[PDB]
Motif scaffolding. Structure first.
Motif, PDB file in Angstrom:
ATOM      1  N   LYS A  56       0.793  -1.271  -0.117  1.00  0.00           N
ATOM      2  CA  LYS A  56      -0.117  -0.114   0.030  1.00  0.00           C
ATOM      3  C   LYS A  56       0.903   1.173   0.157  1.00  0.00           C
ATOM      4  CE  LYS A  56      -3.797  -2.661   0.535  1.00  0.00           C
ATOM      5  NZ  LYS A  56      -4.878  -2.421  -0.627  1.00  0.00           N
ATOM      6  N   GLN A  57       1.481   1.776  -1.284  1.00  0.00           N
ATOM      7  CA  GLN A  57       2.452   2.664  -1.278  1.00  0.00           C
ATOM      8  C   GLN A  57       1.731   3.825  -1.261  1.00  0.00           C
ATOM      9  OE1 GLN A  57       3.649   2.108  -5.402  1.00  0.00           O
ATOM     10  NE2 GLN A  57       5.226   0.662  -4.760  1.00  0.00           N
ATOM     11  N   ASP A  58       0.313   3.967  -1.189  1.00  0.00           N
ATOM     12  CA  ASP A  58      -0.434   4.908  -0.968  1.00  0.00           C
ATOM     13  C   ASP A  58      -0.288   5.803   0.589  1.00  0.00           C
ATOM     14  OD1 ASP A  58      -2.458   7.005  -1.508  1.00  0.00           O
ATOM     15  OD2 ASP A  58      -3.999   5.901  -0.538  1.00  0.00           O
ATOM     16  N   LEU A  59      -0.121   4.513   1.477  1.00  0.00           N
ATOM     17  CA  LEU A  59      -0.058   4.727   2.992  1.00  0.00           C
ATOM     18  C   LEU A  59       1.391   4.747   3.478  1.00  0.00           C
ATOM     19  CD1 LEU A  59      -2.749   2.075   3.919  1.00  0.00           C
ATOM     20  CD2 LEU A  59      -3.042   4.487   3.526  1.00  0.00           C
ATOM     21  N   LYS A  60       2.243   5.155   2.386  1.00  0.00           N
ATOM     22  CA  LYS A  60       3.758   5.339   2.825  1.00  0.00           C
ATOM     23  C   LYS A  60       4.057   5.956   3.909  1.00  0.00           C
ATOM     24  CE  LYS A  60       3.482   9.562   1.546  1.00  0.00           C
ATOM     25  NZ  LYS A  60       2.246   9.612   0.553  1.00  0.00           N
ATOM     26  N   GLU A  61       3.286   7.188   4.343  1.00  0.00           N
ATOM     27  CA  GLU A  61       3.649   7.898   5.442  1.00  0.00           C
ATOM     28  C   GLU A  61       3.501   7.246   6.565  1.00  0.00           C
ATOM     29  OE1 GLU A  61      -0.202  10.928   4.602  1.00  0.00           O
ATOM     30  OE2 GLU A  61       1.161  10.676   3.014  1.00  0.00           O
ATOM     31  N   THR A  62       2.303   6.323   6.499  1.00  0.00           N
ATOM     32  CA  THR A  62       2.174   6.052   8.046  1.00  0.00           C
ATOM     33  C   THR A  62       3.089   4.612   8.007  1.00  0.00           C
ATOM     34  OG1 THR A  62      -0.452   6.122   7.605  1.00  0.00           O
ATOM     35  CG2 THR A  62       0.160   4.774   9.535  1.00  0.00           C
ATOM     36  N   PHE A  63       3.331   4.080   7.085  1.00  0.00           N
ATOM     37  CA  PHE A  63       4.305   2.851   7.175  1.00  0.00           C
ATOM     38  C   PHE A  63       5.628   3.407   7.740  1.00  0.00           C
ATOM     39  CE2 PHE A  63       1.501   0.251   4.355  1.00  0.00           C
ATOM     40  CZ  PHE A  63       1.481  -1.036   5.449  1.00  0.00           C
ATOM     41  N   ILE A  64       6.137   4.318   7.223  1.00  0.00           N
ATOM     42  CA  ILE A  64       7.433   4.973   7.604  1.00  0.00           C
ATOM     43  C   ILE A  64       7.212   5.444   8.893  1.00  0.00           C
ATOM     44  CG2 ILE A  64       9.300   6.573   6.997  1.00  0.00           C
ATOM     45  CD1 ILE A  64       8.419   6.390   3.902  1.00  0.00           C
ATOM     46  N   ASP A  65       6.276   6.454   9.452  1.00  0.00           N
ATOM     47  CA  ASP A  65       6.125   7.011  10.764  1.00  0.00           C
ATOM     48  C   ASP A  65       5.887   5.726  11.876  1.00  0.00           C
ATOM     49  OD1 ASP A  65       4.407   8.685  13.039  1.00  0.00           O
ATOM     50  OD2 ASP A  65       6.157   9.356  12.198  1.00  0.00           O
ATOM     51  N   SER A  66       5.301   4.950  11.634  1.00  0.00           N
ATOM     52  CA  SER A  66       4.913   3.682  12.427  1.00  0.00           C
ATOM     53  C   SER A  66       6.044   2.875  12.771  1.00  0.00           C
ATOM     54  CB  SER A  66       3.605   3.010  12.102  1.00  0.00           C
ATOM     55  OG  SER A  66       2.587   3.619  11.913  1.00  0.00           O
ATOM     56  N   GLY A  67       7.164   2.974  11.841  1.00  0.00           N
ATOM     57  CA  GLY A  67       8.301   2.309  12.067  1.00  0.00           C
ATOM     58  C   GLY A  67       8.618   0.994  11.605  1.00  0.00           C
ATOM     59  N   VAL A  68       7.802   0.618  10.249  1.00  0.00           N
ATOM     60  CA  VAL A  68       7.848  -0.453   9.730  1.00  0.00           C
ATOM     61  C   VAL A  68       9.477  -0.905   9.388  1.00  0.00           C
ATOM     62  CG1 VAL A  68       7.847   0.279   7.291  1.00  0.00           C
ATOM     63  CG2 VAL A  68       6.681  -1.936   7.837  1.00  0.00           C
ATOM     64  N   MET A  69      10.273   0.081   9.083  1.00  0.00           N
ATOM     65  CA  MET A  69      11.583  -0.057   8.859  1.00  0.00           C
ATOM     66  C   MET A  69      12.127  -0.922  10.169  1.00  0.00           C
ATOM     67  SD  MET A  69      11.517   1.215   6.146  1.00  0.00           S
ATOM     68  CE  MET A  69      13.160   0.812   5.601  1.00  0.00           C
ATOM     69  N   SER A  70      11.803  -0.912  11.363  1.00  0.00           N
ATOM     70  CA  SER A  70      12.244  -1.450  12.543  1.00  0.00           C
ATOM     71  C   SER A  70      11.470  -2.861  12.527  1.00  0.00           C
ATOM     72  CB  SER A  70      11.765  -0.810  13.651  1.00  0.00           C
ATOM     73  OG  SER A  70      12.391   0.592  13.992  1.00  0.00           O
ATOM     74  N   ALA A  71      10.428  -3.065  12.231  1.00  0.00           N
ATOM     75  CA  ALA A  71       9.660  -4.247  12.461  1.00  0.00           C
ATOM     76  C   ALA A  71      10.693  -5.361  11.204  1.00  0.00           C
ATOM     77  CB  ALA A  71       8.264  -4.133  12.015  1.00  0.00           C
ATOM     78  N   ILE A  72      10.598  -4.651  10.088  1.00  0.00           N
ATOM     79  CA  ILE A  72      11.184  -5.377   8.877  1.00  0.00           C
ATOM     80  C   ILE A  72      12.618  -5.654   9.425  1.00  0.00           C
ATOM     81  CG2 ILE A  72      12.256  -5.344   6.660  1.00  0.00           C
ATOM     82  CD1 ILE A  72       9.908  -3.193   5.909  1.00  0.00           C
ATOM     83  N   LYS A  73      13.452  -4.947   9.960  1.00  0.00           N
ATOM     84  CA  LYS A  73      14.626  -5.108  10.527  1.00  0.00           C
ATOM     85  C   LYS A  73      14.848  -6.336  11.454  1.00  0.00           C
ATOM     86  CE  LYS A  73      16.556  -3.962  14.790  1.00  0.00           C
ATOM     87  NZ  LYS A  73      15.987  -4.091  15.959  1.00  0.00           N
TER      88      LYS A  73
END
Length: 150
Positions: A56-73
């Motif tokens: 959901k590239q549309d929701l890119k903002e929430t994904f980055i702010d919610s810290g998806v990068m940390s969960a993927i890590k």
């Protein structure tokens, strides 16, 4: 029931935040499963489920702010057994990391996702195909350009 009378984005944000949480829970569950020496595959059962949401590239903002990068890590982070069953999952996750728009280098640094990718990129057991996207990520997430090059 309600209707739009201003920003209507709410349900989508809750779902993205809940996805980050569920990814975290699956990562922690794998630690507990391993503690009991049982197969740990929660990241795997959740893999096609996250991909549907992560796209959901549309929701890119929430994904980055919610810290998806940390969960993927943490999904990239294996158990102390050093076996990497996360390989099958990473095949999708690496791609999604390149679908990000303009995530700040600070986010990649703070989440430690760059370190997680580098760990697997330099891992001697890992295949060339998976390493390619891992190397691309290190390249696109700011090349250090020390000098002495074209």
């Amino acid at each position: 029931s309600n209707a739009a009378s201003g920003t209507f984005i709410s349900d989508a944000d809750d779902v993205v935040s809940a996805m980050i949480v569920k990814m975290n829970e699956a990562a922690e569950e794998d630690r507990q499963l391993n503690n009991q020496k049982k197969p740990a595959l929660k990241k795997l059962t959740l893999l096609p489920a996250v991909v549907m949401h992560l796209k959901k590239q549309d929701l890119k903002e929430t994904f980055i702010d919610s810290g998806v990068m940390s969960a993927i890590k943490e999904w990239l982070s294996p158990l102390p057994d050093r076996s990497l069953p996360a390989l099958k999952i990473r095949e999708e996750l690496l791609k999604i990391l390149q679908e990000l728009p303009s995530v700040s280098q600070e986010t990649l640094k703070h989440s430690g996702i760059g370190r997680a990718v580098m760990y697997l990129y330099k891992h001697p057991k890992e295949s060339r195909s998976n390493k390619d996207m891992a190397g691309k990520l290190i390249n696109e997430w700011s090349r250090p350009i020390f000098g002495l090059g074209s």
